[PDB]
Design a protein around this nucleic acid. Structure first.
Ligand SMILES: [Zn+2]
Ligand SMILES: [Zn+2]
Lengths: 178, 282, 113, 286, 178, 113
DNA sequence: TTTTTTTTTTTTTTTTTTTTTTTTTTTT
């Protein structure tokens, strides 16, 4: 399998809780304040500064601002090529893995490309739609968790209300983190 | 009627059947055995119009009525015939009691989220982000069937298994992944569609593949390398792909894209507004 | 640790005293190619945009991200990013700005752990 | 504002500071260490208006904000800057958080871009201007001097080089010394001119003077004797000339008051006549 | 000490009373009709004749006219060089010691140099200013001399009125000469 | 004993019959290079100056000291000294001439021995 | 309608030289 890249506001990534998987092959993920488990991030913003390419070409990075937050986007080794593509002022869409370095969340670039201003508008519309969809589902799942917890009975009730079983585990994990 | 032979399909309403054709071939009348044990007659012809060819099958009294009246080069008009699928999958015109023939006539002649996609899905429209580039390469193809052609060193010519000695055309193959926020799917584009997305000519891609192969890489290795080194810029681009989903016995679902196009942002925003209205936002 | 403050989306007429970095979207009405300044009209007001290197064209629709400069001559924007918003559906943008204004505070307030 | 750079003074109210200037020089931005141990940036420029020049010092974010936007020949307007005394006693404009700069401003200013009689002179007098007649020529000579400190250099015969006690091995320059007297009608004072000022008054090159001194010394005269002889024999023509000398008065323990002239210039006759008219008005003539 | 060269009209030198000091080291001086004691003279005029250099180079002389009088200027031995500097027609400024030869006052050249026509104008302005200054001071000093003479009381009165003690002695000496 | 009579400073229009040697200051308006004569204009008149060797240039401001020659052809000056008065402030000279005229006779008359 | 076939995943980041001031008398 290959899980989805979740379209989010940079603020939601920044305020999230990064989870480092102990296994050498397990993917790292983030749990947002609204109990959203995110493996990959899909953001749309403006490149605010001219990229930073290390002289030794070991890493390349660029900054993206979407209005709700500012995040760094990093490409290592030959992946430095991604940072060379962009320039200060470009309006871009970024997909990648969420990483945490020095307790600051960032995006490990998988892809970056220039977008039309209407794509930024489409991004804002989709981000808000998905956010409302998720919050309403998580609110019902939280009530199920507070009443029954993670039991075989609660899993059946969650499926009946259109809630994935994984959502109850995310709530429990978030409660454990907090 | 403006109907053409190319428009015939098996099981179409015989009342709609109205085609003309010039007689190309006439086969001898034959006997056939009926379900009741009696023996009937059947005779076949091949006709063609400006669009294609069709077998015309005359049954029983229609053989006596028309067969000797028809000759090669004559034009016939066929009405009210049943359309059947031939043994090669093509439409045939069956001239039974209901059908009529006029000798030498006076005639002028769906949006689906990746999470909902299934194996074998047909005509699926998916809007998403290019997430990965697997391979970029070009192969010599037949200009008719678009299949891989073989170079014969003994004769110095290019041989297509279906069309024989042909002049090869360079066919571009683009394998990538697409993400819509609810799922991930592999995508394959061919020729003109792939060249349009890549923004590089197939002859230029062939030259770059040759340089990589000369360095000690196989065709497989060179295709993956060119995708990562030169076509990584395509990643992150939002596009709309349309195609059919085939299930590979190890690679999983592969979307064979017939076409790709740029996102119509107003159309997409309207879809989102519909979803927001369903959530009680507007 | 002065982390980069994200550009706050505003209309020219709604700029606040506490705002230090803003995002404005409008049409260019005048370009001074000697003092590197241009006049941006968004429908709600006109802002004088001081640019360092990129000067737009007259009549071009542009999005400007800049730092606000408050002096005795008035309030001018020192442009950091100037983007071509010529084919942008500002009607749709205005509609999403209103949707975010209404729904974002309600979504945050729904959290009853 | 009508304010000029010449009107700036250290500690003046930054709210009054409003000057314009064309950029004459731009120096590279530098780092500096703060009292808290952090490192900041600072960059300096030289600007001038129709009245004078000023150093402009851009501090920290003002360097990032303005430094690359400014170029030589551009005019800037400076507002609300602190005025400090430079290391040479002159006003400098400090561009800190409070200050503002306007690049190529719209401003009307942009298009525009002590006498003492010898009878009153005392020992140790500074910045005295005296107008008088050259009355006597004591000595004319040239010595090998250091190009930096202008002090007498010594020739080392062991190493074959010229040694300055302050700067070591140096390339010597010929320094001219002119000792003469000046009379203003109310008194007499000894005067000494050096190098370029002395050469300008004498109208002879220091290399030519050195050659004439050498000829005199070869004849059996000492350096002292040759210097007095050359002044009387060749530079007697300078006597009787009216000049304006400016300098400081030092008192020699036997020679008396000696005016070490920093500069000399020709008499401005209209300026002098105006001074005399002032005196005549005081006497009840006009 | 070295006393000053007084700027005067040639007429004032010519009409003066030369005083020969009996001492071999005492400087000779002149007392003008306005009681001015003059040790050295400073005059500005035109050289009216080509200089006279004795064949044996023992003396050199030249004539200067300032409009108020005509005087000879003399340089002896090597000082003949001063006369060689000038030519007929030169407008010059002369400083030197006053001498009397054959009951005619003359100037023993100490320095002679060509001047700009505005220096001649400056000279006339200074000469007149100094003359008025001196006459007014000598008038007050003469009243003191006629009332008290040269006494300790008159010297105190002279200092109070800005008059030098030497001025009273000059008046007494001039009265003795006349 | 005919001692040299000092040159009496005059204007061309103020020359007296008893004057034998004068000092005049003016501008050259004409030079005759064959008869060695030139025309001097001071503002008050024009005098014909006969020169022996030095001829000035036309338009040059000069000061002439000469002996007056009275003949049947008129009054001409036989020039003794001709000096270049081109940079001379004649305004200042005129002012000092008036100061001397007023104050010199008064200073001489103050002597009450 | 096509080529050729093994999907995904972690971690790595900076102001001078050298010293004795001035003065009488001599003239074709
Ligand atoms: Zn083929
Ligand atoms: Zn030195």
């Amino acid at each position: 399998k290959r899980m989805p890249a979740t379209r989010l506001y940079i603020k939601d990534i920044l305020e999230g809780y990064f989870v480092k998987s102990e296994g050498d092959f397990e993917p790292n993920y983030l749990i947002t304040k609204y109990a959203r488990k995110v493996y990959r991030a899909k953001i749309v913003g403006t490149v605010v500064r001219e990229p930073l390419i290390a002289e030794d070409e070991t890493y390349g990075k660029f900054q993206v601002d979407d209005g709700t937050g500012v995040i760094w986007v990093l490409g290592f080794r030959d992946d430095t090529k991604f940072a060379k593509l962009v320039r200060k002022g470009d309006l871009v869409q970024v997909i990648g893995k969420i990483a945490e370095w020095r307790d600051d969340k960032q995006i490990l670039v998988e892809g970056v490309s220039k977008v039309h201003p209407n794509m930024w508008i489409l991004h804002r519309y989709e981000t808000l739609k998905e956010k409302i969809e998720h919050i309403k589902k998580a609110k019902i799942a939280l009530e199920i968790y507070n009443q029954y917890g993670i039991t075989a009975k609660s899993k059946v009730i969650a499926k009946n209300k259109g809630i994935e079983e994984e959502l109850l585990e995310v709530i429990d994990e978030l409660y454990g983190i907090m | 009627s403006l109907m053409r032979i190319s428009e015939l399909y098996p099981g179409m309403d015989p009342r709609e059947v109205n085609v003309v054709g010039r007689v190309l071939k006439k086969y001898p009348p034959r006997e056939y055995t009926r379900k009741d044990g009696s023996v009937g007659r059947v005779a076949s012809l091949i006709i063609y119009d400006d669009s294609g060819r069709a077998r015309v099958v005359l049954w029983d009294a229609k053989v006596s009525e028309y067969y000797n009246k028809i000759e090669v080069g004559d034009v016939i008009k066929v009405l009210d015939a049943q359309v059947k699928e031939s043994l090669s999958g093509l439409p045939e015109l069956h001239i039974n009691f209901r059908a009529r023939i006029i000798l030498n006539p006076d005639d002028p002649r769906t949006r689906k989220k990746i999470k909902d996609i299934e194996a074998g899905d047909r005509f699926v429209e998916v809007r998403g982000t290019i997430a990965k580039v697997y391979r970029v390469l070009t192969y010599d193809a037949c200009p008719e069937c678009k299949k891989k052609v073989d170079y014969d060193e003994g004769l110095g010519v290019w041989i297509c298994p279906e069309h024989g000695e042909v002049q090869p055309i360079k066919m571009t193959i683009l394998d990538f992944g697409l993400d819509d926020g609810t799922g991930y799917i592999r995508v394959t584009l061919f020729g003109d569609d792939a060249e349009e997305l890549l923004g590089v000519s197939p002859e230029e891609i062939a030259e770059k593949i040759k340089e990589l192969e000369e360095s000690g890489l196989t065709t497989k290795e060179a295709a993956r390398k060119l995708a990562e080194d030169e076509f990584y810029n395509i990643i992150g681009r939002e596009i709309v792909v349309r195609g059919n989903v085939i299930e590979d016995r190890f690679l999983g679902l592969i979307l064979r894209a017939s076409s790709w196009e740029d996102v119509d942002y107003r159309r997409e925003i309207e879809r989102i507004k519909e979803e927001l209205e369903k959530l009680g936002v507007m | 640790v002065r982390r980069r403050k994200p550009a706050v989306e505003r209309k020219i007429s709604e700029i606040r005293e506490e705002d230090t970095r803003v995002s404005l979207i409008g049409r260019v009405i005048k370009v001074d190619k000697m003092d590197y300044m241009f006049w941006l009209d968004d429908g709600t007001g006109v802002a004088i945009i001081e640019s360092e290197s990129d000067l737009p064209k007259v009549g071009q629709v542009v999005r400007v991200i800049g730092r606000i400069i408050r002096n005795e001559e008035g309030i001018h924007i020192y442009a950091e990013v100037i983007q071509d918003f010529s084919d942008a559906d500002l009607e749709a943008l205005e509609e999403i700005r209103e949707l975010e204004r209404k729904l974002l505070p309600r979504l945050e307030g729904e959290i009853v752990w």
